[PDB]
Design a protein around this ligand. Structure first.
Ligand SMILES: Nc1nc2c(ncn2[C@H]2C[C@H](O)[C@@H](COP(=O)(O)NP(=O)(O)OP(=O)(O)O)O2)c(=O)[nH]1
Ligand SMILES: [Mn+2]
Ligand SMILES: [Mn+2]
Length: 539
DNA sequence: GACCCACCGGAC
DNA sequence: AAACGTCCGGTGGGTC
């Protein structure tokens, strides 16, 4: 490209280099723009940001986030990564997209700007005629990038002193459990090393090996194996407790307080828009979509996510979302009637699992039933189900039979989806988002059947993702006009932050927007709560 | 110091 | 572990 002086003309493609991948923490090392066969390189990147009207190019959202961090309203526009991701969601990184559609991802701003230009032209042309993918781009993914940039730059408040105190308490309990393990083993070793633990459990203590690991064939020490051995030796129960506490301390309690940003005083995740095979978002650096919630200690961690003073958190979460989606996609009359009658299949599975009235189901029980319902739906074996429910093999196989007998149109939909996936090579969501699954025709059965479970999961999970994304796009301008913030997305859940005096109005409105995002053959119901902390808002 | 591999486990 | 799916991250073990 011919070099031309900064600034670039309006509408040019942007290229940029960060000192590190996280835009909230990155130094902007270089900034360039390309257009009309010309490349423009900025003498001072920070100053030159003020010249741009929007971020148009590869990884546009990251540049927009850094602009917001600097107090600049620079919205993200076109991003050929989003085009590539709609054509094939295995298009997840710039390195791969470049090597597929006509360029090379380097470390220089100007080359990245020129690459963004050539890649947009090529990919936009590949979408000519793909009307449904173009609708998803214009109506969901491109506007969604702007919502996500604002969420990333806003962040979430964390009770740091709380988590600091909690680390010290959890350490004390870890030390006691460790001493108990070493004593029950008769000697110390590195309880964090699964190799050392394997030798101690299965060679020294002679416990029976339940299963083996995939690539190296070691005797597994997974929670499931230990669950199976929970009564075969008292040490197992203690190892299960040690694993729980060390997992939560090392992954959440200790690292999260060290990620507070100095200028915002808040914690900033990244919402990756081209990272999953189904159209879900992902979250990283840190992942705020897998914050603990299940166990009592997990709940204490979740309580550390709090509202700014004078604000409240609002948490909203679709009810039984993939089951409602399945009802719509399959057309099963029986499953539809379940939701038109206000029934709860997680509660009903819970009542059967634990043999208690629906009134007696607690959150820990409902979660367990949740895993059963989706485990069975997406192809869990009677063998594993027998082990999860702790019932005879026969009684687990009888549950899988009843489950699908209740909704006969579902297996019919599974087979039509797989058959169409074999013919077309891809499966698709309600909105036409595609996932290519060529192993539906694999000649090795185990491989093929794994591909089948991925293939008919995708329309259900991806439709639910499409609906959530569309709701975010519709809800975001309403929130800005009410003075409220969108903070987090957790797949079928939003966490908002609102002025105390407006929290109730925001909760009501967000619930309506979410439930009415796109009418299906069943109603979408959204559970909403308000609190000073993430856990209390979910109650 | 950066990176990889395998496994293990958090959430939805 | 096992014929649930989708992700990301810590640890040990290892290399360069
Ligand atoms: N395959 C699979 N999908 C899962 C699993 N857990 C969650 N999902 C998928 C399927 C779920 O529909 C979706 C959202 O998860 P939630 O909000 O935690 N549960 P839901 O919406 O069903 O029930 P309610 O909100 O009334 O508590 O994530 C699982 O173990 N397996
Ligand atoms: Mn839900
Ligand atoms: Mn949820």
């Amino acid at each position: 490209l011919e070099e031309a002086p900064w600034p670039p003309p309006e509408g040019a493609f942007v290229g940029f280099v960060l000192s590190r991948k996280e835009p909230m923490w990155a130094d902007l090392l270089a900034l360039a723009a390309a257009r009309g066969g010309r490349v423009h390189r900025a003498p001072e990147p920070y100053k030159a940001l003020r010249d741009l009207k929007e971020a148009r190019g590869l990884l546009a959202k990251d540049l927009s986030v850094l602009a917001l961090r600097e107090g600049l309203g620079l919205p993200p526009g076109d991003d050929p990564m989003l085009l590539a991701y709609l054509l094939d969601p295995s298009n997840t990184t710039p390195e791969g997209v470049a090597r597929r559609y006509g360029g090379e991802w380097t470390e220089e701003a100007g080359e990245r700007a020129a690459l963004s230009e050539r890649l947009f032209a090529n990919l936009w042309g590949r979408l000519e005629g793909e009307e449904r993918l173009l609708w998803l781009y214009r109506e969901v993914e491109r506007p969604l990038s702007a919502v996500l940039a604002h969420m990333e730059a806003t962040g979430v408040r964390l009770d740091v002193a709380y988590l600091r105190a909690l680390s010290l308490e959890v350490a004390e309990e870890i030390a006691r459990l460790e001493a108990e393990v070493f004593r029950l083993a008769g000697h110390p070793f590195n309880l964090n090393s699964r190799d050392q633990l394997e030798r101690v459990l299965f060679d020294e203590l002679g416990l029976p090996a339940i299963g083996k690991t995939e690539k190296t064939g070691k005797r597994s020490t997974s929670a499931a194996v230990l669950e199976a051995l929970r009564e075969a030796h008292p040490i197992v129960e203690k190892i299960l407790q040690y694993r729980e506490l060390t997992k939560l301390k090392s992954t959440y309690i200790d690292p999260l307080p060290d990620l507070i940003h100095p200028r915002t005083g808040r914690l900033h995740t990244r919402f990756n828009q081209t990272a999953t095979a189904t159209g879900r978002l992902s979250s990283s650096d840190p992942n705020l979509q897998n914050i603990p919630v299940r166990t009592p200690l997990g709940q204490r961690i979740r309580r550390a996510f709090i509202a700014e003073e004078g604000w409240l958190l609002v948490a909203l979460d679709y009810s039984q979302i993939e089951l409602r989606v399945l009802a719509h996609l399959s057309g099963d009359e029986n499953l539809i009637r379940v939701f038109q009658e206000g029934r709860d299949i997680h509660t009903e599975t819970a009542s059967w699992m634990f043999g208690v009235p629906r009134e007696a189901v607690d959150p820990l029980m409902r979660r367990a039933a949740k895993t059963i319902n989706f485990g069975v739906l997406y192809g869990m074996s009677a063998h594993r189900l027998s082990q999860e429910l702790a019932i005879p093999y026969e009684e687990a196989q009888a549950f899988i039979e009843r489950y699908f007998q209740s909704f006969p149109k579902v297996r019919a939909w599974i087979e039509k989806t797989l058959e169409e996936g074999r013919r077309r090579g891809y499966v698709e969501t309600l909105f036409g988002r595609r996932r290519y699954v060529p192993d539906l025709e694999a000649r090795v059965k185990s491989v093929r059947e794994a591909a089948e479970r991925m293939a008919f999961n995708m329309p259900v999970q991806g439709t639910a993702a499409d609906l959530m994304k569309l709701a975010m796009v519709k809800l975001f301008p309403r929130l800005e006009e009410m003075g409220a913030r969108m903070l987090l997305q957790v797949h079928d859940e939003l966490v908002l932050e609102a002025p105390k005096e407006r929290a109730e109005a925001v909760a009501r409105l967000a619930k309506e927007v979410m439930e009415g995002v796109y009418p299906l053959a069943v109603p979408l119901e959204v559970e909403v709560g308000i609190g000073e902390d993430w856990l209390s808002a979910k109650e």
